[PDB]
């Protein structure tokens, strides 16, 4: 009798865990936990958990845009996250999340691909940002985006040079250089029950028994990078402006958190 | 290099109407229910037939009327000089499987082994031209060694067309030249073809020639195979008593 048990709390303006329908759960990060990787970031929202490792490599660009350093995300929902996933190739949710992360990276323009070209037409960086879920208690997109941004700030790259005599490039793993990122896109999630009831940061069950879901990415300068609205019972702008406000608030909060962290190092 | 000297000879040193000495054997592997080996020149096919046995994981495919033929093809990596990988699962070995399957389902006379797998397996160790026919013939010898009823030796071979003439039992050289090559497999007793593959461009009036030539080559292959089989049966019976 799950749904009924849940409507009782919903109408008491609460949830069975102790959250007031509009607040998230304990959000925490950990930077630089990993040496083998250029950038590393652990994120966890109470029970939900995500980890991003960003490696850096060389590669030859395309012919349409030689001055473009690729940024390739891939999300991994291994079977140890939840039992709804099975050992094998990637399912559907992983792939959807991957395309979401890529759309974000491409639209928010947090990073200029041009800032990754060493020798146009010949070399350019490729940033393989690999995200891994470890507890899919719910709201995996927020965690994925936040971990991506955190690690992608942690990343400091080496410096390379070109020798015309050898016609090859050399690296200097001693000196390095951080990675400039302009926008700080944060993602805020929503679960829409029958008609008008929007809860924020929905956990697992709340997403299992929901009529629809929503996600909204809100850049710092009062703009949006993505309004992910896969199906749902419907919405009018009045049930949407409020979500945008709450998204701005969450942006503020998590950016303050991330600043405190990068400064506590 | 050349294919038909003006005299009539080939490279290997054989006229158009003849072929290379097949050297075969029946009874290679004893842990099976039927086995064979054949070298139709440099080629070296190897067949195996795990007999009509039970279906496991029934998966609702056990035909109740007739038997279930499952033939698998394989061309070893070191077969050709150019090494290749993924000999199984490719889009060509599976076509060969279909071909062998629709041949032997025609010949193998399945109406007597209903709800049973006849598992045919073919591995090609060396390929120098005529790679399908060697396999057909090896699987035939195998079937026979496994006492599986079958209408007739389903004998196969290949023909080709060069300088307005028909060649029998091509090799890799004239198979690489790009000329028309027509492979087939027929049942001699009735004169009926069980399979007819063909791949290259040529006129129509030049069809009957290569067709009858391949047929006659298959008849010769029939003679050789049946002599082998008769030696085998005779020796076995003599040893029995």
């Amino acid at each position: 009798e799950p749904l009924e048990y849940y409507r009782r709390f919903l109408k008491e303006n609460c949830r069975p865990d102790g959250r007031e329908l509009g607040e998230f759960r304990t959000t925490t990060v950990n930077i630089g936990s990993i040496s083998t990787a250029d950038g590393s970031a652990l994120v966890k929202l109470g029970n939900t958990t995500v980890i991003c490792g960003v490696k850096a490599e060389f590669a030859a660009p395309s012919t349409d845009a030689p001055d473009k350093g690729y940024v390739v995300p891939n999300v991994d929902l291994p079977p140890l996250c939840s039992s709804r996933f099975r050992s094998g190739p990637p399912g559907e949710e992983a792939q959807v999340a991957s395309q979401f992360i890529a759309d974000v990276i491409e639209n928010s323009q947090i990073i200029q691909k041009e800032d990754l070209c060493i020798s146009p037409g010949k070399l350019v960086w490729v940033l393989y940002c690999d995200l891994i879920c470890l507890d899919y208690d719910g709201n995996i997109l927020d965690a994925c985006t936040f971990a991506l941004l955190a690690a992608l700030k942690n990343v400091q790259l080496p410096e390379v040079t070109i020798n015309e005599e050898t016609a090859l490039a050399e690296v200097n793993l001693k000196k390095k250089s951080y990675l400039n990122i302009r926008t700080h896109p944060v993602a805020t999630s929503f679960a829409v029950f029958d008609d008008t009831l929007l809860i924020v940061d929905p956990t697992g069950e709340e997403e299992h028994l929901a009529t629809g879901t929503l996600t909204i990415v809100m850049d710092e300068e009062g703009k949006l990078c993505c309004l992910h609205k896969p199906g749902g019972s419907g919405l009018t702008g009045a049930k949407l402006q409020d979500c945008m406000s709450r998204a701005v608030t969450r942006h503020k909060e998590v950016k303050k958190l991330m600043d405190e962290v990068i400064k506590s190092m | 290099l050349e294919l038909l000297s003006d005299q009539g000879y080939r490279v290997d040193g054989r006229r158009a109407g003849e072929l290379r000495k097949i050297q075969a054997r029946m009874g290679v592997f004893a842990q099976a229910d039927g086995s064979a080996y054949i070298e139709q020149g440099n080629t070296k096919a190897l067949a195996v037939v795990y007999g009509p046995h039970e279906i496991r994981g029934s998966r609702a495919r056990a035909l109740p009327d007739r038997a279930l033929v499952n033939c698998q093809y394989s061309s070893a990596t070191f077969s050709t000089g150019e090494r290749k990988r993924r000999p199984h699962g490719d889009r060509k070995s599976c076509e060969m499987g279909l071909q062998l399957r629709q041949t032997f389902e025609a010949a193998i006379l399945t109406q007597l082994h209903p709800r049973s797998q006849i598992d045919i397996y073919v591995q090609v160790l060396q390929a120098d031209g005529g790679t399908y026919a060697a396999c057909v013939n090896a699987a035939t010898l195998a079937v026979l060694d496994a006492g599986i009823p079958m209408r007739d030796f389903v004998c196969a071979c290949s023909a080709g067309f060069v300088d307005g003439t028909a060649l029998a039992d091509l090799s890799h050289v004239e198979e690489a030249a790009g000329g028309p090559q027509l492979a087939l497999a027929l049942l001699p007793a009735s004169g009926q073809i069980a399979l007819l593959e063909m791949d290259a461009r040529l006129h129509e009036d030049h069809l009957e020639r290569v067709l009858e030539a391949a047929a006659q080559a298959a008849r010769d292959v029939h003679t050789l195979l049946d002599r082998v089989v008769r030696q085998h049966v005779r020796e076995a019976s003599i040893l029995l008593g």
Partner: protein, 286 residues
């Protein structure tokens, strides 16, 4: 598979130092070795150990060397576990055992002292040799790994790579010069290429060439890789069962002795055959 009482019979037999084939616990069976079976390869070999028949092809191709090791070439291994062995293999069910065997064969040759790869280098970072080994299974009657190893060694011994001079030229033009002397082809040493040895434990006694019926009766099996000198390249353990710490040592000592004997016999046989010549007629599958 098989029953329980047969397992009792076999284990008490071993404990008594007899076996259904009336042989002890340190006795292989007649292994029919042959070499130069297939012709299109730069090397080949075949083994028939009881009821397991293995074929091995070896192709010496030209390829780019490995960036971390441009000064020398490399061996690659592929393993076709043809369904002709047991029908329970197909395009997907034999990949498991094939992968296992290939990973072993690699682990035997991350040794740097087995095949002198420096002898396989033409021009560092520019061209090199590559030994594509291709194992082909045709029966499974146990003691699989030892036979595969013996075949690998017989194939290497029977490998004949041609000499090539790769001459550079400006404006990016490269030329290869052959030596028109198929009799003047080089030969790589195998005085270190190791043989595998599979000691399966039955009851409280260890056994070599563990026939299937006895593998099903066992709980552990130690794979050793020995060279003719006495060293132990690899030491792996396989089995859904446990294994004591002391028996390991006996297994290792026995593997050492058996490797000595095995390598001696193989070396003698293959020198014999190389002596004979084309007079042997290369009886294979006939």
């Amino acid at each position: 598979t098989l029953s329980e009482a047969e397992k009792v019979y076999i284990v008490h037999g071993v404990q008594e130092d007899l076996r259904v084939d009336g042989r002890g616990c340190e006795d292989y069976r007649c292994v029919e070795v042959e070499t130069d079976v297939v012709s299109n390869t730069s090397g080949s070999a075949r083994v028939k150990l009881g009821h397991t028949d293995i074929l091995v092809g070896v192709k010496a191709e030209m390829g780019t060397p490995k960036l971390e090791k441009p000064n020398e070439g490399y061996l690659e291994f592929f393993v076709d576990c043809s369904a002709s062995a047991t029908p329970e293999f197909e395009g997907r069910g034999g990949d498991d055992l094939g992968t296992e065997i290939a990973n072993t064969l690699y682990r035997i040759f991350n040794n740097k002292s087995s095949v002198d790869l420096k002898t396989l280098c033409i021009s560092p970072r520019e061209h090199c040799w590559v030994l594509y080994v291709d194992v082909l299974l045709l029966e499974c009657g146990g003691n699989l790994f030892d036979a595969i190893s013996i075949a690998v060694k017989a194939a290497l011994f029977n490998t004949r790579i041609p000499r090539v001079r790769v001459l550079e030229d400006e404006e990016g033009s490269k030329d290869i010069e052959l030596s028109d002397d198929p009799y003047d082809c080089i030969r790589l040493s195998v005085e270190n290429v190791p043989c595998i040895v599979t000691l399966c434990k039955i009851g409280y006694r260890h056994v070599v060439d563990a026939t299937l019926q006895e593998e099903a009766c066992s709980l552990a099996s130690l794979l050793v890789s020995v060279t003719s000198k006495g060293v132990v390249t690899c030491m792996r353990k396989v089995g859904k069962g446990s294994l004591d710490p002391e028996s390991i040592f006996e297994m290792m000592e026995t593997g050492k002795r058996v490797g000595k004997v095995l390598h001696a016999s193989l070396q003698s046989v293959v020198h014999k055959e190389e002596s004979l010549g084309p007079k042997r007629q290369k009886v294979g599958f006939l």
